[model samples]
Target chain A: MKVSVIGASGRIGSAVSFLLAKEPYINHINLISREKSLNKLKGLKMDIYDALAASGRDADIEVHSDKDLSVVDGSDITIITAGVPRNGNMSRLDLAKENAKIVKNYARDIAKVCDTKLFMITNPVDVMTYKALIESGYEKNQVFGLGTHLDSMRFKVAIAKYFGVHIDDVRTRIIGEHGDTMVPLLSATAIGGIPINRLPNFENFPYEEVIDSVKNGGKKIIELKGGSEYGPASAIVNIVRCIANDEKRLLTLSAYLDGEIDGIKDVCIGVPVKVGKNGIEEVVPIKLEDDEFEAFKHSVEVVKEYCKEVK
Target chain B: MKVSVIGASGRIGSAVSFLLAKEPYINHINLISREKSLNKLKGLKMDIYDALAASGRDADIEVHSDKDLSVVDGSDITIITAGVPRNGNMSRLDLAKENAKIVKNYARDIAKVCDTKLFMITNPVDVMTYKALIESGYEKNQVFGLGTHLDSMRFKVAIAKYFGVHIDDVRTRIIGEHGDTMVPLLSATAIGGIPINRLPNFENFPYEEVIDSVKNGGKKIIELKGGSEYGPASAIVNIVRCIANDEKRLLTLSAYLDGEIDGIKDVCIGVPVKVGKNGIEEVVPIKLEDDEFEAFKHSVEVVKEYCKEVKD
Candidate 1:
């Protein structure tokens, strides 16, 4: 399968490149960088392509890079990591406005060439996802962002830590805005099919602190490392792998709501969905706690406010 | 399951740490480095542990680093990547001696603690494996290196490329030694259960050239990237995962043999092994082509010569 990556010269963009380079199914990659960095992009493309070639995959795994947006044509998936990153104290709306214009043109360009699923990875992703969905005019399902996929991984990490279980054993999810307004589905939480409340250490469990941790997780990583790479890169690779292999795993992802959750519609929100070759195959609906439902509605309002201001 | 890493500050060690940090089963990691680099290993341990903690897994994934060799005692598995690396022009015996002394001490310390399975990743690993086995006096089955496992992956990668298939779709094996002396079981190779000889493109396939590529694969990556990380790291993690989960996959591994392959006995070499909780649960015996068997015997002799140097 062929994948097109825009903004392939940036941090998260390059991480996506390294991650996808290892995927055996991906035989061709089109890396689109800024016009000025095309020379460097060519080098990066060749370096990665040669890395795979030397690693025993002499498959005509063609890797191409250009400023020409048309290189994205005929891709099965196109990932947009393009946008100005959120800095030390950037306001949320300010982050939203800058990235929106960037994704808008690419979405329109990609729509003209072929119908490929678009995955957005820039900051203010919930807002960028809405912009891409509207601009591409693709089905809302086809144009989503890196969403709460990262948050859910964080949530599972927290649950695994608290319960002293393997991360894979924790099956809880976080859905809503990909920020503080995110909703943790406490009622739906499980460890190896046992309810969270039924866990041996449930009485003094730091569930609230865990939720607080998820909201500030990115800020904490970006604080120390300058930016996050492996976790998010690893998480998004799951999205690509699920699509490529059609594993149909039920994962928490940023998705458009058409009344899937009560009182939340027309905006992108993090929720559990089945992902496969068709992108999102089904929206998984679950009963939320009363307070969780209230928090879910509030986060939806916050996301919708930013989504509304988009032209 | 807990895993302790010796020479955790090194490149391949850190790569294994990153790969295993995401595994659900591994909860504790002890990273051993030298006194001078203990502070650096400490930072690496914290960065990796915090990355997981931030990723939302508070996995009691406690990671510690120290100059203390005793820290690796209670581990279920101890991976040794803690030796001096081979430079571009190093001789085989020269590579073996430098790594032997390092693995010898670590293996002795590890033997004092518990009978953890030892996975040697340092170069000239076949010799190091023999040294560690003799030094610690562990059962032959308890210690091995990453011999042809990576070579086998390379072989499959080549096969997949030739057939225009996914790497997962190719089933093949590389045996004997990890370096230039390795043997590819081409007659037994298959793509999706169809033998290579039966494939439509078999006549035109550059099978011998691909085998040559596998032999040179490690040197090619090391020359360009300075060192190979992801591919070998991914392969070793598969070994750890198979043992932790007891998946029982029939993977090519460096294992000691008494009678698995005729005329190759009492020494460590790469061959098919069923890896699970017991570690190298069984050595699989398969028929080899006459020329392939001859090549395998020559490779076995080279390894046995190296093994003979280590005190039995």
Candidate 2:
């Protein structure tokens, strides 16, 4: 199937492009960029070619790169990772305000030439996602944000570290905002089918530290380098694979919630959604602790405020 | 399982380490390096962690890096991508002579401290692989090279392009040497399940062009950039995955043969083999065309001459 990557020359964008090239089903890609540097574009394309070549899979990728939106036409999946990333010092809300304006233009540009399912990966994604949804007049399932999956990934990392178990053995969920107010459902967290609180050293579990790490995981990576690439790039492909392969796997994603979640309606939020051939197949519900639900409500309010401002 | 990667700081080595981390079975990795720069090693380690963290796959990886041999002592699998790469101007024979000495030293060092199955990825890998086998005194089944799978993948790409079909629909094989004398078995090649020659428009296929491209694919990448990374790295992980997961998938690999095929024996060469937990389980033999058999015989001769010189 044809996949288009907007901002395909940026750090995260290029990585997402390379990783997706490894997928057997995806053979054609339109790497959309506004950059005038042909050398940079050439390097990005080669990196993808080499990655596919390395995998010993068929390296028959029909790759095309162009500066215009016309390259994105006829794509089945269009991932929008182009926008200003959160700076080393900007607040999430502040980052959203700047990126939301950028999305306003992108949503219009994309709507004019393409009607493919949108996988938005900009900062303040919930706000920009709502804007893209409203501006494009598409169904709720067609456009979603990319945060909750990343947040859930961070939560799983933290849980695995605490318990000294393989990440595959730990099952957990993160909901709400993809930031500070994200709700980590400890009540639903488990290790090898056993509840987290029932583990041998449950009382000493670094609840606050784990929560704080998940909330600020992006900042730590930014501190290490200028920005993170692999983790975010990996997370993005997980969503792409689910949709492209119609994998009925449930993943935490920023999807439209019209009462699919309790007390959170008419807003874009992060929760467990069954992503497959139909985009988001259904919202998979879970039981949340009282405190977790309260945190989620606040997370919903914070996103609603920014989304209203964008509207 | 623990995986030790020698030369873990180089371009192809780091890519192998990162790609292997994506496999669910691997939790511990030893990034063995002799590079003096701890900062470079630290950066490589973080890149892997960040990649794992990004996939949200449970970053339970416990990573360590050192120049010491102890790092590989208990490794379940040891991948040696170390030694010097082939220079742009050097001949493959010259590359072999240079890399064989390095493999001789690596073989001794690894044998002294580790007993893991060896996955060698240096230049002149066929010659160096023989040196590794002899130096380590390891069994023929335990040591394998990384070339035929890569060649077959390239062949698949060419066939898919010709037929205008998905790559997964094409199945082909390349045996013998990893280089110019390598054998491409057309008699056994298939598209989906149909033999390639039976496909429509088979008469117009670019046989010479495809063969030459597979032989020079590495050089083309080296021409484009200074060195190749992604493709070799990807191929290495496929073998690692096969063994780690015990998938028993049949792949064309550089394996040691002793009368497994007609008129070629006592040398390490590429052939289709069942790759699984037992490491090159058994060479899955296929009948070769007359021209292909002659080519295979020449590949065996070239490798035998190199092995004798390395042994000397």
Candidate 3:
């Protein structure tokens, strides 16, 4: 399948491109970057060629400047990672005003060219995803954001470490915004097929510490390594692979909701959805605890406010 | 399994560590870098932690300074990628003299601390593999280099592209040195289990062009993108996975010869061998055409001369 990665010269975009190059099912990758970064994009393409050769994977790569959105035409999937990143002290929402315009313009232009699945990663992702969905005039399922997936992963890691268990043994999800307002669905969490709250000594679990770690995971990496790349890139590849191979995997994404859960609608937010070759196959709904529900509502409100500002 | 990457802050070392973190069997990675690069090593560790978390792979990463060899005391495998890289307008052999001492010193120091299998990636790898093996005083099975494996990959890609076939349909080997003198065993090459020479219109294949492209693949990448990282990194991880998982796969590597191919002995060069949990289990000998055999022997001689220059 053909995939287009916008802003392919950025740290996260480059990593995503390299990993995607290794996917046997991905027949071609259109690496889109700004004209100023075209040389680096070309260099990245050459690097991926060597990488593909070494791995024995056959995938063609083409480099393009984002001056023309038509380059993304005919792409089966277009991943938007083109936006300003959060600096050391900035929140994900802090870059919303700057990234909103970029995301909207690309969405509008790309909509005129092709009807590809839009996977958004530009930050204040929930709002940017809403912007893309509205501007593109596509079905809700055709566009989504890499919302709380990485946050959920960070939460999984934290929980696994806390309980001294393998990550696979802990199954959980974090819904709501992809930022500080994200609500860890403890009500839906389980360990070894048993509810975590039912486990022995559940009262002793440090819920606040784990949540804090999950919330600050990206910030810590950004502080330590300039910005997080590998983690976010891996998360993007996971979703891309699920779509490319039609894995029908249940994943949390920032999807436009129309009474999908708690009768919420009109705003894009993080919720569990089945992802496959057809983009979002279905939005999975689950009951939440009163506090989790309240927190999620607040998150929806926060995202709605940002969306309105961008609109 | 614990894997120690000696030059963990370098391009290849960092990529190898990242890929290793995704392997469920590899439980720990010790990232060793020089003092000046310790901060970046720590950054890499954080980055890998995030990668592991995202991929649902649980692996611990530790950063270490090269000053303390004891940090690698419990490693099952210690990969050496800590050496000068070739710049534009330079040959792989150009960095041989500079890299030999680094490899031998690390080999000697690591051997004193652990009996880990030493996988060498420093440039002029054939010569460095020999230096590491002799300096460490380890069994030949425990020392090898990422030699013609990548060149063989380049060759395979070229062949697949020429025949317009899947890469999996091409089985080929490019053995001998990891450099200009390397030999491509066309007589043994096959597409879809049929000898390449028997293929229809095989005479029209651009053999010289393919060989030149394979030889200059890294040089072209270095010139284009500053230096090759992902390709060499992927090649290193391929072997590490084989050994970590005990796959017993027959692959080409830089191995110490003891009459394994064409009765060559006492020099490290590229040849096919069974790599597993026990390291090089056995060298798989293959017949080479007379011309290929002669070319391989010359490659060995060139490597031998480079080896002598670094020997004590």
Candidate 4:
């Protein structure tokens, strides 16, 4: 499968491209960057070529300038991680205006060349995802954002640490924005196929602390590491693998809602959806607790507010 | 398995630590860096933790300052990538004196805390491997360097491209030094179990050009990119897995020679050896063409000269 990664010079973009180079099923990777950064992408391609040589893996890497969108032509998937990144103390929503313009221009330009599946990783991803969909005029299924998927992983890590169990033993989800308002689906959390509350001594589980940690996980990494690269990059590749291999995995991503939940429509928000070769196959419906529903609605409204400012 | 990466804050070191964290058999990674780079190591640890969390793969990551060698205590494998790297204009040999001192100090100090198998990746690896072995006083079998293994891979890639065949179909080896003088074993090269020269129209192969490409592969990368990271890092992990899982795979690495090949002794150079839990199990001998032997001897003489500069 062919994939295109925009902003291939950034930390997260480079990491994602390197990881994708190792995927056996991925036959081609188009690394798109600004004209000024083309040399960096060239260097990156050589690095990947050598890396692939070590493993005897075969994959083609092509570097392209964003001024020429034809590089993304015939790509099966185009991942957008381009735009300004969040500063240490800034909120994800703070990147809305600047990043939205970038996402919109790329989305519209790329749509002219090919109707590839769009996966957004830009900050304020929910709003950027909606803007990409509207500006590109593509079906909702064709465009989704890397939303609560990473937050869900963060939540899973927290829960596993709390219960002293393996991450494989815990299955959970986080929905809403990819920020502080993200709702941890405590109502649907499971441990070994059993509801979390039903487990032994589950009363002492610190839900508030766990949720707070999940919300600030990205910020902490940004403070310490200057930015989150490996985590977000891995999350993008995970979903890309599902699409490339047709794994049909259920993942939480930002998808446009036309009454998908709580009568929410128009705006894109994080929800559980079956992701496969055909992009988003179906939005999986679930029952949320009263508080969970309230928080999710608030997140959706916040995302909608940001989305309105984009155009 | 517990693995410690010295110089873990560098490009190649950090990449190796990140890759090792994803290996299922590895349970812990001790990232050792200089005292001043401890915060970078801490940041790296958090980045790795989140990466592992994304994959649901479990591995503990610990950051350590070089001041405390105790962090390497009980490590099954201690990989030394700590040293000055090659500049675009410098030869790998240019790094020998500076890197050898670092390798000797760490190898000697690490031996005090644990008898971990030492894997050296410091540049001028052939000479550094010898310095580490002699300085640490460890068994020759326990100290090895990532030598012509990456060069051999570069050769394989070139050959595969020439033949328009899959890399799996091309079996080749590059031995001697991990430098410009490295010898490519064209006589022993095979494609799909058939001798390369026996293949149809094989006489058309450009032997000298292909070998030259393999020799300058690292230089070209350092020229284009600032330095090579993903390639060398991936090469380290490939051998680490073989040893971690006891795969007993035959790979070309720098090992202390004691008349193992052509009466070469008292120096570590690249040669095919079985790598497993016990480190270099045995140096697998092979016949070398006359020219290949001449080049191998020259490479060894050059390495020996550099090794002599290190303190006993």
TM-score of each: 0.73, 0.79, 0.91, 0.94
Model 1 chain A poorest ten-residue lDDT run: A53-62
The alpha-carbon deviation from the true structure for residue B66 of candidate 3, after best TM-score superposition, in angstroms, is 3.1
Candidate 2 per-residue lDDT over residues A177-286, each given as its tens digit: 87778888888789989999998888999898878877887766665445666677888887888898898987788888888676467888898899998787888777
RMSD of 3: 2.9
Off by over 4 Å in 3: A35-43, A46-56, A85-94, A245-249, B35-39, B85-95, B310-312
Q: Weakest 10 consecutive residues, lDDT, candidate 4 chain B? A: B85-94
How does chain A of every candidate compare to the true chain A by TM-score?
Answer: 0.93, 0.92, 0.94, 0.95
Model 2: per-residue lDDT, tens digit, B84-196?
66557987566667778778877788888878888888767787777788888988878888867777777776787788876667777788888888888888688879998
lDDT (CA) per prediction: 0.76, 0.76, 0.85, 0.85
Range of the 10 consecutive residues with the lowest summed lDDT in candidate 4 chain A: A85-94
DockQ rank order: 4, 3, 2, 1
Error of 2 at A7 (Å): 3.6
Evaluation by lDDT, superior candidate among 1 and 4: 4
Per residue, candidate 1 scores C-alpha lDDT tens digits across B119-234 of: 98887777777778888888876888888887877777667767888666677888888888998888768988999899899999998898897788677766644566656667
Give the per-residue Cα lDDT of candidate 4 at B59. Answer: 78
lDDT of 4 at A11: 89
What value of lDDT does candidate 3 attain over all alpha carbons? 0.85
Model 3 quality (TM-score): 0.91
lDDT of 2 at B185: 80
True contacts kept of 2: 0.33
